[PDB]
Write a protein that binds this ligand. Structure first.
Ligand SMILES: *[C@@H]1O[C@H](CO)[C@@H](O[C@@H]2O[C@H](CO[C@@H]3O[C@H](CO)[C@@H](O)[C@H](O)[C@@H]3O)[C@@H](O)[C@H](O)[C@H]2NC(C)=O)[C@H](O)[C@H]1NC(C)=O
Lengths: 122, 265
């Protein structure tokens, strides 16, 4: 099922196959991947799963499943999406190990990489 | 020959041509609703005829889960989305008690958004990775409605109480071992014919509460779709097979101790 952070997988007999996740109080997302309380990243943010979604300029992030992001090298439909923390949302991530968490942004006609605003817990 | 839409929960669809004995395409949806925000999972595929339109929603402290399933039987009727359905508005919506095993709440209250919806108590114990909840209380419409039905054997206990009166689904959590000895005895088994339901793998279980009929049921289960029998104690359990994810099913009840012997067919 893949429900992370102690989530548990549920289904219902009266409704065919559908299974989803029951996530602990402070974790969201389909698989509980979303750390609903974090307010800063440790290290370079590679393992950051918070809900920040705005860049340095205050612009919103494109969702990791946008038709556009789907043309980039890091998007929600990758076999490893879940592991990179890229999902049906627009939260800052760092799937390529850059210095700090980022996300693509619609800058003119270009989906450019932009570092977000959140800082080190340091 | 009928064709449907198959859509694995992620959104990746494709057109499905239905295997024979599958006269309906269907759309299954779970809307997890918590504090403003909301996830929605959508699954579509062909399905077996016995399938009906159904809804179930329960409250799990600040969260509300809404399962819904709709079946139709025409080419790609499984495609719809924004043509809109029937927008209700009542003066006095029916209120039921609501809870789930998930946060061990089974409690809060729930307003049923539709008039065909009733109050529900669904018990599902020790039967079929993912896992159904033990206890669930809320609003919805499912097979057994209205009334109540039950079954139990060596491996399982299933109970559905469906009722129209206000907060009528309230009361103490129903555990099997608090039902009084029914006085009847029936056989119990599962699995394959000669492999799990043989004359000498089934034994007499002492039935409990309103479960006094002795049933036998045959149909098709999983992992693939092999034949599959079930023997136990029942009430007014018939078309109620998804409480075993059994299809192409034909139940049977008799009201005499041991009457559901494999030798007695
Ligand atoms: C379960 O729910 C579904 C969806 O709400 C119901 O299927 C709908 O049924 C009506 C049937 O009326 C027909 O309308 C046709 C127009 O397409 C036409 O051939 C003729 O007028 C006929 O009377 C249909 O209009 C809806 O479009 C159906 N839904 C879809 C998307 O196929 C179904 O009946 C409900 N319950 C049962 C008993 O299965």
């Amino acid at each position: 099922c893949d429900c992370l952070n102690g989530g548990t997988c549920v289904s219902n007999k009266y409704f065919s196959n559908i299974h989803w996740c029951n996530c602990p109080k402070k974790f969201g997302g389909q698989h509980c991947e979303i750390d609903k309380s974090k307010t800063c990243y440790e290290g370079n943010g590679h393992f950051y799963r918070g809900k920040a979604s705005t860049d340095t300029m205050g612009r919103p992030c494109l969702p990791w499943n946008s038709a556009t992001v789907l043309q980039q090298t890091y998007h929600a439909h990758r076999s490893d999406a879940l592991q990179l923390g890229l999902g049906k949302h627009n939260y800052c991530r760092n799937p390529d190990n850059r210095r700090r968490p980022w996300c693509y942004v619609q800058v003119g006609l270009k989906p450019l990489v932009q570092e977000c605003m959140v800082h080190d817990c340091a | 020959s009928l064709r449907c839409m198959q859509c694995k929960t992620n959104g990746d669809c494709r057109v499905e041509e239905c295997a024979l004995g599958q006269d309906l395409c269907r759309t299954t949806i779970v809307r997890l609703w918590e504090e403003g925000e909301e996830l929605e999972l959508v699954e579509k595929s062909c399905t077996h005829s016995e399938k009906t339109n159904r809804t179930l929603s329960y409250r799990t402290g600040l969260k509300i889960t809404s399962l819904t399933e709709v079946v139709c039987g025409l080419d790609l009727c499984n495609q719809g989305n924004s043509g809109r359905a029937v927008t209700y508005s009542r003066s006095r919506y029916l209120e039921c008690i609501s809870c789930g095993s998930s946060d061990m709440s089974c409690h809060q209250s729930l307003q049923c958004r539709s008039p065909e919806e009733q109050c529900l108590d669904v018990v599902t114990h020790w039967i079929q990775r993912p896992k159904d909840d033990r206890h669930l209380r809320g609003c919805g419409y499912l097979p057994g409605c209205p009334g109540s039905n039950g079954f139990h054997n060596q491996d399982t206990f299933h109970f559905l109480k469906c009722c129209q009166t206000t907060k009528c689904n309230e009361g103490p959590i129903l555990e099997l071992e608090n039902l009084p000895q029914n006085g009847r005895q029936c056989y119990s088994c599962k699995g394959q014919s000669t492999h799990g339901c043989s004359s000498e793998e089934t034994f007499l279980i002492d039935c409990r509460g309103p479960m006094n009929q002795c049933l036998v049921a045959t149909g098709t289960h999983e992992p693939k779709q092999q034949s599959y029998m079930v023997r136990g104690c029942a009430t007014a359990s018939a078309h109620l097979g998804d409480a075993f994810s059994m299809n192409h099913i034909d139940v049977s009840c008799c009201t005499k101790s041991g009457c559901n012997h494999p030798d007695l067919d």
